[PDB]
Design a binder for this molecule. Structure first.
Ligand code: 0VE
Length: 267
């Protein structure tokens, strides 16, 4: 969990930019050298980082970004495995050629990472296309656990600026975040991915979105999105937390359809 500042090399290039900066570098390991992304800070800003690190520390899954450890030097630094191709939304924005089967593949991988995080009783609270990173065009990993919370053994929700367009009704009305509300965010993620990285509820303020949903209105089918995937989207968008599927039922739906799509190409 604690890293050797001298074993860390940072590039002048800044990958992203709030808290401070995200830079690329390499950590000199046992024998091999590891490409890394490093979250770097500029009191309470420091405590969020530690908490964040502690969450990733506990997570062990192919579809979730892995942390290498932390470092105190010029600033506080959170060192993670590098996801070379970056955020899912921007990739799709710049790569509109990406095939339907390839998107269904990537959203299914995120369902697997989310089914694990559910099993592990963690809430993400920030599940957005921007927070999915690509290892390859066919390998996706969930990132950004700065808003994540480990649920108490006695409760199945955590009681709390907010990414409102990604939030379920219960979150807005009752400040209650559960794995089911991540399922809601997943719906919006599915939409963003089939809309090739376009922002959801275009040009509407949070207030208006809240009103639209309450009316029973949902976002429409993105162009070229299979009916079956839009059904899953709407299902994720079940207003009443109690009747909304968990990521188990969600992932299995995706798994099945993806194999039906894989069967079709071969035919
Ligand atoms: C230049 C932008 N660009 C595309 C290059 O053409 C680009 C941008 C980012 C990345 N890769 C990564 N960016 C940010 C984080 C990160 C940071 C903080 C927290 C956290 O959980 C994760 N990260 C973790 C692992 N890999 C990355 C790769 C390419």
């Amino acid at each position: 969990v604690y890293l050797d500042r001298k074993l860390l090399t940072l590039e002048d290039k800044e990958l992203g930019s709030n808290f401070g900066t995200v830079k690329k570098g390499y950590y000199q390991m046992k024998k091999v050298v590891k490409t890394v992304a490093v979250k770097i800070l500029k009191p309470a800003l420091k405590d969020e980082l530690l908490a964040e690190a502690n969450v990733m520390q506990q997570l062990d899954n192919p579809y979730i970004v892995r942390m290498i450890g932390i470092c105190e030097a010029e600033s506080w630094m959170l060192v993670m495995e590098m996801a070379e191709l970056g955020p899912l939304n921007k990739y799709l924005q710049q790569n509109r050629h990406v095939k339907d089967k390839n998107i269904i593949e990537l959203v299914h991988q995120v369902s697997m990472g989310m089914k694990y995080l559910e099993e592990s009783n963690f809430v993400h609270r920030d599940l957005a296309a921007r927070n999915v990173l690509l290892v390859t065009q066919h390998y996706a990993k969930i990132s950004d656990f700065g808003l994540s919370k480990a649920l108490r053994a006695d409760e199945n929700y955590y009681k709390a600026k907010w990414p409102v367009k990604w939030y379920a009704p219960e979150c807005i009305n009752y400040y209650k975040f559960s794995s089911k509300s991540d399922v809601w965010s997943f719906g919006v993620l599915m939409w963003e991915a089939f809309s090739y990285g376009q922002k959801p509820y275009r040009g509407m303020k949070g207030s208006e979105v809240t009103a639209m949903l309450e009316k029973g209105e949902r976002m429409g089918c993105p162009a070229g999105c299979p009916r079956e995937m839009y059904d899953l989207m709407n299902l994720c968008w079940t207003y009443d937390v109690e009747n909304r599927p968990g990521f188990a039922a969600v992932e299995l739906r995706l798994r099945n359809y993806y194999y039906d799509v894989v069967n079709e190409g071969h035919h």
